[PDB]
């Protein structure tokens, strides 16, 4: 079949993966598991 | 201060493993896509 | 039915993108605030320094100047965030509403702090 | 200037002079005792003006350092 | 994705790190925690 | 004089630890970058 | 929007650099003053002498 | 001198990333061209 | 530019005018989008005719 | 052209740089002769395809 | 001051004089 590719579902998953990847790298750079970003704002506060 | 690290200080000796997993996924799903986008090509090349 | 589906789909792709730009907006705002917090961290650092050995640092005057400089920063950071020429958080921001789907009034109201300079 | 918009600038106030305006350090001509003692009164005051100037600089690159960490995070997320 | 690298955020952090590094080395050379520079001008004064 | 040192005299027996931390960060974030800049390379090499 | 973003970004990179040169300026000024203070320290040393 | 470097001294720890991006583009657009120049070939081979 | 007071006002100039440009470019946006549809459409007409 | 606010005396060179770019906005303004009746400089007469 | 909060201070009471008041 040609009209589209259901396997773009694969793509979606990778977008999530890359998001996680980048955030992990941030945490690995600074050593701060709570980014200076809002994320987990409780511990941040 | 020790508390401040227990809050912030990533146990990156674990997050390294998480990191590999993410890199790994990028690689894998990619290769899957390099395979996936060959499917319709085959379909039509043959039915023609 | 499909015409309704294509309606939904491509509309929601645009709405996805509008949301992503919104994510970036709130990200830049977050950075600005992080650094406001570095300043305010310094302001307690300076207020405590300004005990002065209780009266022994006559050159609190210099500290006062230091303070004034940092106070001016909380105006500069308050300005200068012109994501749109309609910048984030100083003065008056109007509590905007990011659409995230394809239907009307399907939006995420956001409540940026009206000011940073003179209202902290 | 420290951003991209007009009049977005950090005024700086370098001391107008150092030689003859730190009355003057060069005025004193110690050789007499009564001028030695008053000399100390001169240098003390003027030195305070200097280290006020140095502390003005304190505020200015502290201001810069933050400003550029901050600006840098802006240009990031933009 | 290729148009840019969000991981340049890592770079930014390192710039800060290197700044701190250099200043520390200065303090370690002379033994003066307050550099002759303006920094912490109160104690300097 | 003792005061003058309490003002100036770095307790560098602590700042050594701070120093290592900074050197350490230079090293680490660098290696992270050596990894990071391999990402787009992989992305395109595979999708092609 | 992007044209406005690129406007902002690269403009602010230049402004960053202008600021960095300013940091250096104030640094050199600071050094000059440090040494003015060494002299003035000596001037009290000599006035007392 | 420190100023002279802030003027000149490339923060090549960033320009490495820029570098990869350029190398990457050379590679990618090239492979795109290896694909692109196959288009007219197909067009005529089939209409004939 | 050469004077600072003209540098800053210069930015105020370029900003406004650049907005006018990208309005012009966006005018073109509407025009070949308009064309593209128009010719898919016209083409389907001449088809079924 | 903030110039480190007054520290780049060689704004003069920048002025020359500016002048060059200003001349570009004439060259690009000309040189687009799709028809000998070029696109956008001077007076184009709002044509109707 | 010896902590981070306001009015968290150690009052000290140096003798007002030494010369003519001993």
In order of A30, E10, E22, E23, the CA distances from F18 in angstroms are: 14, 20, 12, 11
- Please give the distance of CA F25 from its chain centroid, rounded to a whole number: 2
| CB contact residues (below 8 A), chain I span 3-32, against chain G | 15, 18, 22
Tokens of H11: 């923060």
Chain D hits for C73, CB-CB cut-off 8 Å, are 63, 66-67
D52 to C35: CB separation less than 8 angstroms, yes or no: no
CA dist., res. I18 & res. G7, Å (int):
10
Which residue from C minimizes the CA distance to G8?
A: C82
Neighbors of chain K by Cβ distance (3+ pairs < 8 Å): C
Task: For C53, list phi and psi in degrees, rounded to 5.
Answer: 60, 35
Long-range contacts formed by F41-47: CB under 8 A, 24+ apart: F41/H20, F41/H23, F41/H24, F42/B26, F42/B27, F42/B30, F43/B26, F43/B30, F43/E1, F43/E2, F44/E2, F44/H24, F44/H27, F44/H28, F44/H31, F45/H27, F46/B27, F46/B30, F46/B31, F46/B33, F46/B34, F47/B30, F47/B33, F47/B34
The minimum CA-CA distance between D20 and chain E, rounded to whole Å, is 22
Binary contact (G15, D72; C-beta < 8 A): no
Beta strands in chain C (DSSP E): 97-99, 107-109
CA angle C120, D6, D11 (to 5 degrees): 70
> What is the secondary structure of B1-48 as a DSSP string?
-HHHHHHHB--HHHHHHHHHHHHHHHHHHHHHHHHHTTHHHHHHHHH-
Taking an 8 Å cut-off on Cβ atoms, the answer to whether E7 and F32 are in contact is yes
Other beta carbons within 10 Å of D35: 15
Question: Residue C11 and residue A23: Cα distance in Å, rounded?
Answer: 29
**Chain G residue with Cα closest to E45:** G37
CA distance E25 to chain G (A): 17
Cα D71 from Cα G22, distance rounded (Å): 15
Question: Measured in whole angstroms, how far is the alpha carbon of residue E8 from the centre of its chain?
Answer: 18
- Resolution of the experimental model in angstroms, please? 4.3
Q: In the structure encoding, which two tokens stand for residue I35, read together?
A: 């064309």
Residue J21 contacts D, CB cutoff 8 Å: no
C108 three-class SS: strand
Q: CA-CA-CA-CA torsion for E38, E44, F5, F7, nearest 10 degrees?
A: -100
Q: Cα dist. D70→C16, C29, C36, C38, D74 in Å?
A: 28, 11, 9, 10, 6
The torsion of the CA quartet E3, F33, D63, C28, rounded to 10 degrees, works out to 40
Rg of chain C taking only CA atoms, in angstroms: 22
- Please give the method by which this entry was determined: cryo-EM
Nearest to D69 by CA among C115, C24, C31, I19: C31
First to last CA, chain I: 62
């Amino acid at each position: 079949v040609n009209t589209n590719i259901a396997s773009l579902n694969t793509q979606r998953n990778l977008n999530a993966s890359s998001n996680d990847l980048n955030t992990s790298l941030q945490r690995l750079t600074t050593g701060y598991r709570i980014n200076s970003a809002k994320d987990d704002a409780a511990g941040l506060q | 201060t020790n508390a401040r690290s227990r809050i912030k200080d990533t146990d990156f000796a674990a997050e390294t493993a998480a990191l590999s997993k993410n890199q790994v996924l990028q690689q894998a799903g990619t290769a899957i896509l390099a395979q996936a986008n060959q499917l319709p090509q085959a379909v039509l090349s043959l039915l023609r | 039915i499909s015409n309704r589906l294509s309606n939904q789909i491509s509309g929601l792709n645009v709405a996805t993108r509008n949301a992503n730009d919104g994510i970036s907006l709130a990200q830049t705002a977050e950075g600005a605030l992080q650094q406001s917090t570095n300043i305010l961290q310094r302001i307690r650092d300076l207020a405590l320094q300004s005990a002065n050995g209780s009266n022994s640092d006559a050159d609190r005057a210099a500290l006062q100047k230091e303070v004034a400089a940092q106070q001016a920063e909380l105006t500069r950071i308050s300005d200068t965030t012109t994501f749109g020429g309609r910048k984030l958080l100083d003065g008056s921001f109007g509590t905007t509403s990011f659409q995230v789907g394809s239907n009307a009034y399907e939006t995420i109201d956001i409540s940026l702090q009206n000011a940073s300079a003179s209202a902290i | 200037q420290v951003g991209s918009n007009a009049y977005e600038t950090i005024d700086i106030s370098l001391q107008n002079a150092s030689a003859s305006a730190i009355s003057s350090v060069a005025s004193v001509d110690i050789s007499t005792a009564d001028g030695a003692q008053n000399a100390i009164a001169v240098v003390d005051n003027a030195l305070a003006a200097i280290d006020a100037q140095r502390a003005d600089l304190a505020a200015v690159q502290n201001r810069f350092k933050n400003t550029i960490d901050n600006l840098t995070n802006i240009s990031e997320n933009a």
